[PDB]
Design a protein around this ligand. Structure first.
Ligand code: 2Q5
Ligand code: 2Q5
Ligand code: DIU
Ligand code: DIU
Length: 583
């Protein structure tokens, strides 16, 4: 009854500003092609109704579920069908089915214009109206990333306000702002991929997959906490992530604030690093908790072999509650090994399971399971080796060269994937060298497997919507935890039928000359993928010969008196020499 006024309750708990920011984010993520001006109106209508409900909770409609009021507002958008086609059909449904329907139409690759920073323009807008400026920011990010973790987005608006406040008083605005925006953009993209993975886990592997992942991660972060404190927190946190992934953004933010306050209330049982966070206002406090460094491993923890290999009762304990016993193995192993990746720790738990399945049926189980850590070694040696060979390859060739070697690998592994996605994924995979090869020894495996999971999840999300490789389907869907090693093991897809040589990718207009460097590399990388789709067994020398010819040709025509003339009239030679080189 009273708290049937969910909207008043959210408005009271979050305050007007956050309430509006979250409602704006929600409309932007479901209706990614509506203009800001439209969404601002819908936000203001809901905020007014919220204020009415707050003054009187018995006003008509104040008892509806917030997520029902929100859906209803979606359904009352006049251009809903015009713009979102089928999406309109979702309106014929009852909740929760309606929402699930809408969520199905979130577009992970909306291919919205690139937002290129005009420092003076940004600053004029920021000076004119700070609130509108931040609103437009939330809307641009949220419509491009319809799974962006909403409370963090509110945070990135707040944190970066100082940016604009400082920068926009400077005479040289561009020199001040541009580095900061690049940094902002980097934070955003990583935050987006991370949340997109959490929402994919929950949807494709279920809530329990995200819980296991979080047990391992939180046991590393707060290794002094009790198992049951970690599971309480992971459960609350996974609820918050679920609510955010399902578009329940105000309940999401409200739950996260309670979680943040719970963690600060119990900081002494969790981690001494939390002291930093616990006197901050709520968005910042939450952000700081999500980013806290791993606490030190306490002293005097028994060796893992005591409960899990040496003990005579392993089988009985396992048999009485497998899930608890294995959750507990995962907690005990994670808290002791901050230098292992979460996904490696989950692999270790899975193999430990398979071992006791095998061992607990035998005549003498103890003799078999006592040596289990020897059997697990390989799951630690394989990632370290992956890092060692790829980092050496990265440092031998640098980022661009490492990207190209990954283009060659991935195009062979999944040559049916569209060329822009293979390029996009391969360039990100190459950047995992830039982000992780130089890290401390104990951060390298966590850094590498985490970024790999984010980027492979991105390939899985794109592929799930237009499946074209059965091997990608298998590695995306068979096991979240083994995704990375499943992709790692793929070899040249032997069922693939090469395409004819696609010349357009080796033919250009004069405006290639003025492309930003990044775009120029993407041009060469596109060409490289297309070489491999045509001749997947091309040799390193043939690939090198073709690309060198390519760059030499582009240089030559960009030097010409008549650039378009040289590209058009000489262009057939590059095409011919490229084909000659692949013989
Ligand atoms: C209605 C309004 C746009 O006019 O909505 C957006 C607004 C509430 O932005 C919230 C955002 C978190 O505030 C940023 C800080 C720096 O004030
Ligand atoms: C599910 C996982 C493979 O993803 O491996 C099994 C194991 C790690 O389960 C952990 C899970 C969080 O159990 C915790 C229960 C006891 O509270
Ligand atoms: O994902 C988060 O936002 C997050 C938020 C809180 I509060 C605490 C933890 I640990 C988190 O990891
Ligand atoms: O932050 C998480 O909770 C998280 C969850 C999953 I599933 C995968 C990665 I990499 C993560 O960082």
């Amino acid at each position: 009854d009273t708290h049937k006024s969910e909207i008043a309750h959210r408005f009271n708990d979050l305050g007007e500003e956050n309430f509006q920011g979250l409602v704006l984010i929600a409309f932007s993520q479901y209706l990614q092609q509506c203009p800001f001006d439209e969404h601002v109106k819908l936000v203001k209508e809901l905020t007014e109704f919220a204020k009415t409900c707050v003054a009187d909770e018995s006003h008509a409609g104040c008892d509806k579920s917030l997520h029902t009021l929100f859906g209803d507002e979606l359904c009352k958008v006049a251009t809903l069908r015009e713009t979102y086609g089928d999406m309109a059909d979702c309106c014929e449904k009852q909740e929760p089915e309606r929402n699930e329907c809408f969520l199905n139409h979130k577009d992970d690759s909306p291919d919205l214009p690139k937002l290129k920073p005009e420092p003076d323009t940004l600053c004029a807008e920021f000076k004119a109206d700070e609130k509108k400026f931040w609103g437009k920011y939330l809307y641009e990010v949220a419509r491009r990333h319809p799974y962006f973790y909403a409370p963090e987005l509110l945070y990135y608006a707040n944190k970066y306000n100082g940016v604009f406040q400082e920068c926009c008083q400077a005479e040289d605005k561009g020199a001040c702002l541009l580095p900061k925006i690049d940094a902002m953009r980097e934070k955003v993209l990583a935050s987006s991929a991370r949340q997109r993975l959490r929402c994919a886990s929950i949807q494709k592997f279920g809530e329990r997959a995200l819980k296991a992942w979080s047990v391992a991660r939180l046991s590393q972060k707060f290794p002094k906490a009790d198992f049951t404190d970690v599971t309480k927190i992971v459960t609350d946190l996974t609820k918050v992530h679920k609510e955010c992934c399902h578009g329940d953004l105000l309940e999401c933010a409200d739950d996260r604030a309670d979680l943040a306050k719970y963690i600060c209330d119990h900081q002494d049982a969790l981690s001494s690093k939390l002291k930093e966070c616990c006197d901050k206002p709520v968005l910042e406090k939450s952000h700081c908790i999500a980013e806290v460094d791993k606490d030190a491993v306490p002293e005097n923890l028994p060796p893992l072999t005591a409960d899990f290999a040496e003990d005579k009762e392993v089988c009985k304990n396992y048999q009485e509650a497998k899930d608890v016993f294995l959750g507990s193995f995962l907690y005990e192993y994670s808290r002791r090994h901050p230098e292992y990746a979460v996904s490696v720790l989950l692999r270790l738990a899975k193999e430990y399971e398979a071992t006791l399945e095998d061992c607990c049926a035998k005549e003498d189980p103890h003799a078999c399971y006592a040596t289990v850590f020897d059997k697990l070694k390989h799951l630690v040696d394989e990632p370290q080796n992956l890092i060692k060979k790829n980092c050496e390859l990265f440092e031998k060739h640098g980022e661009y060269g490492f990207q190209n070697a990954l283009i060659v690998r991935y195009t062979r592994k999944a040559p049916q994937v569209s060329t822009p996605t293979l390029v996009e994924i391969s360039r990100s995979l190459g950047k995992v060298g830039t982000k992780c090869c130089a890290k401390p020894e104990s951060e390298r495996m966590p850094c590498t497997e985490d970024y790999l999971s984010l980027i492979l999840n991105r390939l899985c999300v794109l592929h799930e919507k237009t499946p074209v490789s059965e091997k990608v389907t298998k590695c995306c869907t068979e096991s979240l935890v083994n995704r990375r090693p499943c992709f790692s093991d793929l070899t040249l897809d032997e069922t693939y039928v090469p395409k004819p040589f696609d010349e357009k990718f080796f033919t250009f207009h004069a405006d290639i000359c003025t492309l930003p460097d990044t775009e120029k590399q993407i041009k060469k990388q596109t060409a490289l993928v297309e070489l491999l789709k045509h001749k997947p067994k091309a040799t390193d020398e043939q690939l090198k010969t073709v690309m060198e010819n390519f760059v030499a040709f582009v240089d030559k025509c960009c030097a010409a008196d008549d650039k378009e003339g040289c590209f058009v009239l000489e262009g057939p030679k590059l095409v011919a020499s490229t084909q000659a080189a692949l013989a």
